[PDB]
């Protein structure tokens, strides 16, 4: 019997700073035990300082990104070139996803950008549209490997102040773009080591008020 879904592997990662936000993702595309492409980007600039990635089944992922990109275009036409805020984009994506509630897009979606106060924002979606704003989110094949590391290093979970008898927690603070990129790179090298579907290359998209910058790094190709 025909199975309309497939697993294209890969993994993605979003972190939000004070005045910036990053959305990273490896460039490896796979089916079963074969590599399809060592460089197939899945993190996209969608306009209005919104970056998006829909990891999982690539065909559904591409379809969604394509449709959201188109949603941004028509938002400009219908509302006098108004900038689509990250919170508005998120809600719009929920309706795109839930629109196919009974034949879902098999993807974990993450978008990143700046909120209307200029602060860094990351939103994450399940396959049928439930969404939540967070400081931190990993998605995809190696999400289970990366996410607990992020809890520890971004949100300082289970870390207490030395000598305070485990009474005072390590205080929360925003990370610099330099420190965030260090965590992204270490997360992906670690994921590459222990997950077979992760490797080849790492592409990061950084979002500030100035625009959308890109950075690329090699990953192990085994």
């Amino acid at each position: 019997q025909f199975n309309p879904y497939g697993d294209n592997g890969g993994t993605i990662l979003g972190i939000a700073g004070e005045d910036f936000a990053v959305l990273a993702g490896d460039t490896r595309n796979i089916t079963d035990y074969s590599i399809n492409s060592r460089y197939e980007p899945k993190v996209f600039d969608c306009g209005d300082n919104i970056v998006m990635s829909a990891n999982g089944f690539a065909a559904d992922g591409d379809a969604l990104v394509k449709r959201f990109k188109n949603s941004v275009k028509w938002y400009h036409f219908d509302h006098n070139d108004k900038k689509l805020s990250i919170n508005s984009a998120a809600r719009n994506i929920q309706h795109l996803l839930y629109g196919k509630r009974f034949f879902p897009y098999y993807v974990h979606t993450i978008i990143a950008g700046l909120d209307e106060d200029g602060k860094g924002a990351v939103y994450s979606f399940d396959p049928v549209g439930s969404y939540e704003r967070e400081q931190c989110r990993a998605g995809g094949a190696a999400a289970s490997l990366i996410m607990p590391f992020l809890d520890n290093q971004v949100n300082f979970k289970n870390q207490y102040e030395p000598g305070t008898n485990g009474k005072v927690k390590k205080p929360l603070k925003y990370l610099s773009v330099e420190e965030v990129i260090k965590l992204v790179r270490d997360s992906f090298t670690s994921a590459t080591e222990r997950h077979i579907q992760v490797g080849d290359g790492l592409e990061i998209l950084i979002v500030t008020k100035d625009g959308v910058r890109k950075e690329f790094y090699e990953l192990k190709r085994d």
Binding site: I30, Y160, P162, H195, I196, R221, D222
Partner: protein
């Protein structure tokens, strides 16, 4: 796994990668897939990891007792026969896929065994998930009358094909050279083309970070 075997002028060489998987997770990044049945009969194993280890040790044990009983150096065909009859008895439920090779008083030999108990003879062979990647290389570059150094190169190249192109294979290349009239040389980690790059950050915690409830000295002595 990716495993290969290649015959040459005065003997035979076998090789293997060093990845061990647990679903999509890499459990061991440097496991040894080359097994010693007798001093000059070695075995490359793919499939169910426990089974390849157990079956190779059992036959290796019985080969040693047989060698002592007969006052003769063991033959590859004896290991081949004992393995295939054992595997056949278990109707494929013992998931061991082996490349058996070695030198003995009869000469140099190269065989493969499958889980259901079928054996094959050849000058070049490959088994495992990355056998197609390896066999592609072997079919492209193999020739009659290979030297020792040419066979090692061809064998490791065939393993590399698996390492890079097959997600089931990775990390390092193990080699074992069995030449006639000489001791077999086991070249553990013959190639190490997948070294982990320096991490961006040290995650050494300040002492006292972890909250503790109780301490106690444990008694290991009598």
């Amino acid at each position: 796994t990716t495993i290969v075997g290649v015959k040459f002028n005065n003997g035979v060489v076998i090789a293997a990668d060093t990845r061990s998987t647990q679903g999509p997770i890499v459990a061991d990044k440097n496991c040894a897939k080359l097994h010693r049945i007798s001093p000059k009969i070695w075995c490359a194993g793919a499939g169910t990891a426990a089974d390849t280890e157990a079956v190779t040790q059992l036959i290796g044990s019985n080969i040693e007792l047989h060698s002592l009983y007969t006052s003769r150096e063991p033959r590859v065909v004896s290991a081949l026969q004992m393995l295939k009859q054992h595997l056949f008895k278990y109707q494929g439920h013992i998931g061991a896929y082996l490349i058996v090779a070695g030198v003995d008083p009869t000469g140099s030999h190269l065989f493969s065994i499958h889980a259901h108990g079928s054996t094959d003879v050849g000058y070049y062979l490959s088994l495992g998930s990355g056998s197609l990647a390896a066999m592609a290389v072997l079919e492209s570059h193999w020739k009659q009358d290979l030297t020792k150094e040419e066979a090692i190169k061809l064998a490791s190249d065939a393993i590399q094909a698996g390492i890079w192109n097959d997600l089931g294979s990775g990390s390092n290349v193990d080699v074992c050279v069995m030449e006639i009239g000489k001791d077999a040389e086991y070249l553990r980690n013959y190639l190490t083309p997948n070294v982990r790059e320096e991490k961006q950050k040290s995650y050494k915690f300040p002492r006292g970070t972890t909250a503790v409830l109780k301490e106690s000295i444990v008694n290991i002595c009598d």
